[PDB]
Design a protein around this ligand. Sequence first.
Ligand code: P32
Length: 286
Amino acid sequence: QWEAGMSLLMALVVLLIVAGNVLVIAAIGSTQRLQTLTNLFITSLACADLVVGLLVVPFGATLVVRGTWLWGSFLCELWTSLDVLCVTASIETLCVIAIDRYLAITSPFRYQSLMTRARAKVIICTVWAISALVSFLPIMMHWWRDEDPQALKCYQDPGCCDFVTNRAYAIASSIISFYIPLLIMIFVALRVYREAKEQIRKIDRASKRKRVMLMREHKALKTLGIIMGVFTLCWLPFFLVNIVNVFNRDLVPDWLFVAFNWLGYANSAMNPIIYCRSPDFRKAFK
Ligand SMILES: CC(C)(C)NC[C@H](O)COc1cccc2c1CC(C#N)=N2
Protein backbone atom coordinates (compact mmCIF):
# COMPACT_ATOMS: atom_id res chain seq x y z
CA GLN A 1 0.00 0.00 0.00
CA TRP A 2 2.57 2.50 -1.28
CA GLU A 3 -0.09 3.31 -3.95
CA ALA A 4 -1.91 5.66 -1.51
CA GLY A 5 1.03 8.08 -0.94
CA MET A 6 1.74 8.01 -4.66
CA SER A 7 -1.87 8.94 -5.57
CA LEU A 8 -1.44 11.77 -3.02
CA LEU A 9 1.74 13.31 -4.52
CA MET A 10 0.49 12.97 -8.11
CA ALA A 11 -2.81 14.69 -7.21
CA LEU A 12 -0.65 17.47 -5.77
CA VAL A 13 1.39 18.06 -8.96
CA VAL A 14 -1.91 17.82 -10.90
CA LEU A 15 -3.08 20.64 -8.64
CA LEU A 16 -0.05 22.85 -9.33
CA ILE A 17 -0.37 22.39 -13.11
CA VAL A 18 -4.15 22.73 -13.55
CA ALA A 19 -4.58 25.64 -11.12
CA GLY A 20 -1.49 27.53 -12.35
CA ASN A 21 -2.37 27.21 -16.02
CA VAL A 22 -6.09 28.01 -15.67
CA LEU A 23 -4.99 31.04 -13.65
CA VAL A 24 -2.81 32.14 -16.58
CA ILE A 25 -5.53 31.51 -19.21
CA ALA A 26 -8.13 33.38 -17.13
CA ALA A 27 -5.92 36.35 -16.15
CA ILE A 28 -5.12 37.06 -19.80
CA GLY A 29 -8.82 36.25 -20.33
CA SER A 30 -9.85 39.16 -18.06
CA THR A 31 -7.27 42.01 -18.12
CA GLN A 32 -7.20 43.43 -21.68
CA ARG A 33 -4.37 45.59 -20.31
CA LEU A 34 -2.60 42.18 -20.16
CA GLN A 35 -3.65 40.92 -23.63
CA THR A 36 -0.22 41.77 -25.14
CA LEU A 37 0.97 39.64 -28.10
CA THR A 38 3.65 37.73 -26.18
CA ASN A 39 1.03 37.16 -23.48
CA LEU A 40 -1.25 35.47 -26.04
CA PHE A 41 1.56 33.14 -27.05
CA ILE A 42 1.99 32.41 -23.34
CA THR A 43 -1.68 31.47 -23.60
CA SER A 44 -0.99 28.89 -26.30
CA LEU A 45 1.70 27.52 -23.96
CA ALA A 46 -0.59 27.48 -20.92
CA CYS A 47 -3.21 25.49 -22.89
CA ALA A 48 -0.67 22.90 -23.95
CA ASP A 49 0.56 22.50 -20.34
CA LEU A 50 -3.00 22.53 -19.13
CA VAL A 51 -3.78 19.53 -21.33
CA VAL A 52 -0.61 17.82 -20.01
CA GLY A 53 -1.61 18.24 -16.37
CA LEU A 54 -5.25 17.32 -17.11
CA LEU A 55 -4.81 14.08 -19.07
CA VAL A 56 -1.25 13.24 -20.00
CA VAL A 57 -0.12 13.26 -16.37
CA PRO A 58 -3.10 11.59 -14.66
CA PHE A 59 -3.35 8.71 -17.15
CA GLY A 60 0.47 8.46 -17.21
CA ALA A 61 0.33 8.29 -13.40
CA THR A 62 -2.02 5.27 -13.32
CA LEU A 63 0.51 3.39 -15.52
CA VAL A 64 3.47 4.14 -13.23
CA VAL A 65 1.45 3.19 -10.11
CA ARG A 66 -0.25 0.05 -11.53
CA GLY A 67 2.60 -1.22 -13.79
CA THR A 68 -0.05 -1.61 -16.58
CA TRP A 69 -2.66 0.12 -18.83
CA LEU A 70 -6.21 -0.10 -17.55
CA TRP A 71 -7.93 1.85 -20.32
CA GLY A 72 -7.34 -0.37 -23.38
CA SER A 73 -5.65 -0.18 -26.81
CA PHE A 74 -7.38 2.81 -28.36
CA LEU A 75 -7.30 5.18 -25.41
CA CYS A 76 -3.64 4.16 -25.10
CA GLU A 77 -2.91 5.11 -28.69
CA LEU A 78 -4.79 8.44 -28.32
CA TRP A 79 -3.21 9.40 -24.97
CA THR A 80 0.22 8.88 -26.50
CA SER A 81 -0.86 11.11 -29.44
CA LEU A 82 -1.84 13.84 -26.96
CA ASP A 83 1.45 13.68 -25.06
CA VAL A 84 3.35 13.98 -28.34
CA LEU A 85 1.09 16.83 -29.51
CA CYS A 86 1.51 18.76 -26.26
CA VAL A 87 5.29 18.74 -26.47
CA THR A 88 5.37 19.59 -30.23
CA ALA A 89 3.02 22.52 -29.55
CA SER A 90 5.03 23.79 -26.54
CA ILE A 91 8.26 23.88 -28.54
CA GLU A 92 6.73 25.37 -31.73
CA THR A 93 5.11 28.17 -29.68
CA LEU A 94 8.46 28.88 -27.93
CA CYS A 95 10.17 29.02 -31.31
CA VAL A 96 7.55 31.47 -32.56
CA ILE A 97 7.96 33.59 -29.39
CA ALA A 98 11.66 33.91 -30.00
CA ILE A 99 11.06 34.95 -33.66
CA ASP A 100 8.37 37.51 -32.69
CA ARG A 101 10.85 38.99 -30.20
CA TYR A 102 13.65 39.28 -32.76
CA LEU A 103 11.36 41.12 -35.21
CA ALA A 104 9.81 43.32 -32.48
CA ILE A 105 13.35 44.50 -31.76
CA THR A 106 14.99 44.73 -35.19
CA SER A 107 12.04 46.22 -37.09
CA PRO A 108 10.01 48.01 -34.37
CA PHE A 109 8.38 50.41 -36.87
CA ARG A 110 7.15 47.71 -39.32
CA TYR A 111 6.13 45.54 -36.32
CA GLN A 112 3.26 47.69 -34.93
CA SER A 113 1.75 48.22 -38.40
CA LEU A 114 1.54 44.50 -39.35
CA MET A 115 1.29 42.45 -36.11
CA THR A 116 -2.09 42.70 -34.31
CA ARG A 117 -4.02 40.53 -31.80
CA ALA A 118 -6.04 38.82 -34.55
CA ARG A 119 -2.84 38.00 -36.47
CA ALA A 120 -1.40 36.58 -33.22
CA LYS A 121 -4.43 34.26 -32.97
CA VAL A 122 -4.13 33.09 -36.60
CA ILE A 123 -0.44 32.37 -35.87
CA ILE A 124 -1.25 30.30 -32.69
CA CYS A 125 -3.77 28.30 -34.67
CA THR A 126 -1.45 27.52 -37.60
CA VAL A 127 1.10 26.43 -34.95
CA TRP A 128 -1.36 23.94 -33.43
CA ALA A 129 -2.23 22.73 -36.94
CA ILE A 130 1.40 22.03 -37.83
CA SER A 131 1.89 20.55 -34.37
CA ALA A 132 -1.07 18.19 -34.99
CA LEU A 133 -0.09 17.49 -38.64
CA VAL A 134 3.46 16.52 -37.60
CA SER A 135 2.69 14.73 -34.37
CA PHE A 136 -0.84 13.32 -34.55
CA LEU A 137 -1.04 11.70 -38.03
CA PRO A 138 2.15 9.61 -38.09
CA ILE A 139 0.74 7.77 -35.04
CA MET A 140 -2.68 7.16 -36.55
CA MET A 141 -1.30 5.94 -39.89
CA HIS A 142 0.81 3.55 -37.80
CA TRP A 143 4.10 4.83 -39.25
CA TRP A 144 5.51 4.23 -35.80
CA ARG A 145 5.05 0.46 -35.50
CA ASP A 146 8.10 -1.83 -35.13
CA GLU A 147 8.76 -5.15 -36.91
CA ASP A 148 10.43 -6.98 -33.95
CA PRO A 149 8.40 -9.66 -32.02
CA GLN A 150 8.22 -8.17 -28.50
CA ALA A 151 6.94 -4.97 -30.08
CA LEU A 152 3.93 -6.75 -31.64
CA LYS A 153 3.39 -8.51 -28.30
CA CYS A 154 2.83 -5.02 -26.88
CA TYR A 155 0.44 -3.99 -29.66
CA GLN A 156 -1.52 -7.21 -29.04
CA ASP A 157 -1.65 -6.36 -25.31
CA PRO A 158 -4.28 -3.74 -24.23
CA GLY A 159 -2.43 -3.36 -20.92
CA CYS A 160 0.73 -2.66 -22.89
CA CYS A 161 1.01 1.05 -23.63
CA ASP A 162 4.79 1.51 -24.00
CA PHE A 163 5.79 3.75 -26.90
CA VAL A 164 7.77 1.12 -28.81
CA THR A 165 8.60 2.55 -32.24
CA ASN A 166 10.71 1.72 -35.28
CA ARG A 167 14.02 3.60 -35.58
CA ALA A 168 13.27 5.66 -38.71
CA TYR A 169 10.26 7.06 -36.80
CA ALA A 170 12.23 7.59 -33.61
CA ILE A 171 14.68 9.74 -35.61
CA ALA A 172 12.37 11.59 -38.01
CA SER A 173 9.72 12.13 -35.40
CA SER A 174 12.10 13.51 -32.76
CA ILE A 175 13.82 15.79 -35.31
CA ILE A 176 10.54 17.16 -36.66
CA SER A 177 8.64 17.51 -33.43
CA PHE A 178 11.56 18.69 -31.36
CA TYR A 179 15.08 19.15 -32.65
CA ILE A 180 14.20 21.54 -35.53
CA PRO A 181 11.91 23.80 -33.40
CA LEU A 182 14.51 23.77 -30.61
CA LEU A 183 17.50 24.72 -32.79
CA ILE A 184 15.64 27.53 -34.52
CA MET A 185 14.46 28.76 -31.07
CA ILE A 186 18.00 28.78 -29.62
CA PHE A 187 19.80 30.44 -32.56
CA VAL A 188 17.02 33.07 -32.65
CA ALA A 189 17.02 33.63 -28.87
CA LEU A 190 20.77 34.28 -29.10
CA ARG A 191 20.57 36.66 -32.06
CA VAL A 192 17.97 38.34 -29.84
CA TYR A 193 20.33 38.49 -26.86
CA ARG A 194 23.04 40.20 -28.95
CA GLU A 195 20.57 42.74 -30.36
CA ALA A 196 19.39 43.48 -26.80
CA LYS A 197 23.03 44.11 -25.86
CA GLU A 198 24.03 46.51 -28.68
CA GLN A 199 20.75 48.23 -27.87
CA ILE A 200 21.33 48.59 -24.14
CA ARG A 201 24.87 49.79 -24.96
CA LYS A 202 23.50 52.57 -27.15
CA ILE A 203 20.45 53.54 -25.05
CA ASP A 204 22.07 57.00 -25.12
CA ARG A 205 21.56 57.13 -28.87
CA ALA A 206 17.74 56.94 -29.01
CA SER A 207 14.83 59.38 -29.15
CA LYS A 208 12.47 59.13 -26.15
CA ARG A 209 10.16 57.62 -28.79
CA LYS A 210 12.14 54.47 -29.80
CA ARG A 211 13.73 54.35 -26.34
CA VAL A 212 10.22 53.99 -24.87
CA MET A 213 8.40 51.52 -27.16
CA LEU A 214 11.51 49.31 -27.05
CA MET A 215 11.52 50.03 -23.30
CA ARG A 216 8.17 48.18 -23.29
CA GLU A 217 9.10 45.41 -25.79
CA HIS A 218 12.38 44.86 -23.84
CA LYS A 219 11.06 44.28 -20.32
CA ALA A 220 9.55 40.76 -20.17
CA LEU A 221 12.52 39.43 -22.14
CA LYS A 222 14.33 37.99 -19.11
CA THR A 223 11.23 35.94 -18.28
CA LEU A 224 10.96 34.48 -21.81
CA GLY A 225 14.66 33.57 -21.59
CA ILE A 226 13.98 31.70 -18.36
CA ILE A 227 10.94 29.87 -19.84
CA MET A 228 12.98 28.73 -22.86
CA GLY A 229 16.05 27.81 -20.77
CA VAL A 230 14.08 25.57 -18.37
CA PHE A 231 12.07 23.89 -21.11
CA THR A 232 15.37 22.91 -22.75
CA LEU A 233 16.53 21.71 -19.33
CA CYS A 234 13.81 19.05 -19.24
CA TRP A 235 13.04 18.03 -22.76
CA LEU A 236 16.60 17.96 -24.05
CA PRO A 237 17.48 15.37 -21.38
CA PHE A 238 14.48 13.24 -22.37
CA PHE A 239 15.14 13.47 -26.15
CA LEU A 240 18.85 12.73 -25.96
CA VAL A 241 18.06 9.71 -23.83
CA ASN A 242 15.62 8.88 -26.64
CA ILE A 243 18.16 9.17 -29.49
CA VAL A 244 20.83 7.05 -27.77
CA ASN A 245 18.18 4.29 -27.54
CA VAL A 246 18.33 4.03 -31.36
CA PHE A 247 22.08 3.31 -31.39
CA ASN A 248 21.82 0.74 -28.60
CA ARG A 249 18.80 -0.13 -26.47
CA ASP A 250 21.04 -1.49 -23.67
CA LEU A 251 22.77 1.83 -23.12
CA VAL A 252 19.87 3.53 -21.34
CA PRO A 253 18.09 2.18 -18.20
CA ASP A 254 14.29 1.95 -18.47
CA TRP A 255 13.74 3.90 -15.26
CA LEU A 256 16.09 6.70 -16.42
CA PHE A 257 13.90 6.88 -19.51
CA VAL A 258 10.84 7.17 -17.31
CA ALA A 259 12.60 9.73 -15.07
CA PHE A 260 13.60 12.12 -17.88
CA ASN A 261 10.06 11.85 -19.20
CA TRP A 262 8.62 12.84 -15.83
CA LEU A 263 11.20 15.62 -15.83
CA GLY A 264 9.61 17.20 -18.94
CA TYR A 265 6.15 16.47 -17.55
CA ALA A 266 6.99 18.51 -14.46
CA ASN A 267 8.02 21.38 -16.77
CA SER A 268 4.29 22.05 -17.27
CA ALA A 269 4.15 23.02 -13.60
CA MET A 270 7.30 25.16 -13.68
CA ASN A 271 5.97 27.72 -16.13
CA PRO A 272 3.23 29.03 -13.77
CA ILE A 273 5.87 29.26 -11.00
CA ILE A 274 8.21 31.23 -13.28
CA TYR A 275 5.40 33.80 -13.72
CA CYS A 276 5.55 34.73 -10.01
CA ARG A 277 8.74 36.60 -11.00
CA SER A 278 7.01 39.40 -12.97
CA PRO A 279 5.22 42.04 -10.73
CA ASP A 280 2.54 42.27 -13.46
CA PHE A 281 1.77 38.52 -13.00
CA ARG A 282 2.71 38.34 -9.27
CA LYS A 283 0.09 40.93 -8.30
CA ALA A 284 -2.39 39.13 -10.63
CA PHE A 285 -1.69 35.91 -8.65
CA LYS A 286 -2.98 37.30 -5.33
C1 P32 B 1 5.00 7.98 -22.08
C2 P32 B 1 5.22 8.58 -23.49
C3 P32 B 1 6.45 7.86 -24.13
C4 P32 B 1 3.95 8.28 -24.32
N1 P32 B 1 5.44 10.06 -23.38
C5 P32 B 1 6.01 10.70 -24.58
C6 P32 B 1 7.14 11.72 -24.34
O1 P32 B 1 6.83 12.55 -23.24
C7 P32 B 1 7.26 12.59 -25.59
O2 P32 B 1 7.65 11.79 -26.68
C8 P32 B 1 7.83 12.34 -27.96
C9 P32 B 1 7.36 13.76 -28.27
C10 P32 B 1 7.56 14.35 -29.68
C11 P32 B 1 8.23 13.53 -30.77
C12 P32 B 1 8.70 12.11 -30.45
C13 P32 B 1 8.50 11.52 -29.05
C14 P32 B 1 9.05 10.14 -29.06
C15 P32 B 1 9.60 9.86 -30.45
C16 P32 B 1 10.22 8.65 -30.89
N2 P32 B 1 10.71 7.67 -31.20
N3 P32 B 1 9.37 11.09 -31.30
